Amino acid sequence: VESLAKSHIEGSFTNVWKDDKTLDWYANYEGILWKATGVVVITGDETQVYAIWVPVGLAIPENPEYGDTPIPGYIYINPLDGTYPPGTEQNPANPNPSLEESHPLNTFMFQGNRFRNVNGVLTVYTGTVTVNGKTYYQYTPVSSKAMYDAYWNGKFRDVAFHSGFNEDPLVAEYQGQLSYLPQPPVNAP
């Protein structure tokens, strides 16, 4: 079963999930765990992901009728891709993640990711982190150029500039650049 030196898969996978820390997408196929690389295209409902699936390890099972034509979707922006690294000349943003005791206010949802904008500085919700007995909420600086480009080009003007006591995240109108996922998924049962 140690066959994870497998050839990459360029295609769509169903039964995907996103890791709450790395914000990468994942799928189990042929008893192998795959990481979605290259240009990653996801359906609006996140049931399917199209990418260059790289084998990263052995499958974990704990973590629909299909056509043969391309289905609409969105180019997923992994906001932790490193194309615009924080704490650099290019990106002067503080490069350190914070541990919030509660979710910060006025955050927004984009591609199922939770973002906080503090005067042009973007941070992303990268899961909970239990520290000395309690649930903290980690917010990691955004290192994606495509994310900042969407922001700068006003693709979040509707959700990124709110102030006031607004605990629940708003949901952005813009959900990414439109693309297509080839069908059916490679791992269809």
UniProtKB/Swiss-Prot annotation:
Residues 1-63 are annotated as: N1. It is found in: Virion; Host membrane. Residues 88-103 have a biased composition (Polar residues). Residues 98-181 are annotated as: N2. It comes from the Viruses. Residues 61-103 are annotated as: Disordered. Residues 64-97 are annotated as: Hinge. Disulfide bonds join I42-V49, V159-A172. Consists of 3 domains (N1/D1, N2/D2, and CT) separated by glycine-rich repeats and a C-terminal transmembrane segment. The N2 domain interacts with the F pilus, whereas the N1 domain forms a complex with the C-terminal domain of TolA at later stages of the infection process. The C-terminal domain is required for release of viral particles from the host bacterial membrane and proper integration of G3P and G6P proteins in the virion. Interacts with G6P; this interaction is required for proper integration of G3P and G6P into the virion. Interacts with G8P. Interacts with the tip of the host pilus. Interacts (via N-terminus) with host TolA. Interacts (via transmembrane domain) with host TolQ (via 2nd and 3rd transmembrane domains); this interaction allows the phage translocation across the host inner membrane. Interacts (via transmembrane domain) with host TolR (via transmembrane domain); this interaction allows the phage translocation across the host inner membrane. Plays essential roles both in the penetration of the viral genome into the bacterial host via pilus retraction and in the extrusion process. During the initial step of infection, G3P mediates adsorption of the phage to its primary receptor, the tip of host F-pilus. Attachment of the phage causes pilus retraction bringing the viral particle into close proximity of the host cell inner membrane. Belongs to the inovirus G3P protein family. This is Attachment protein G3P.
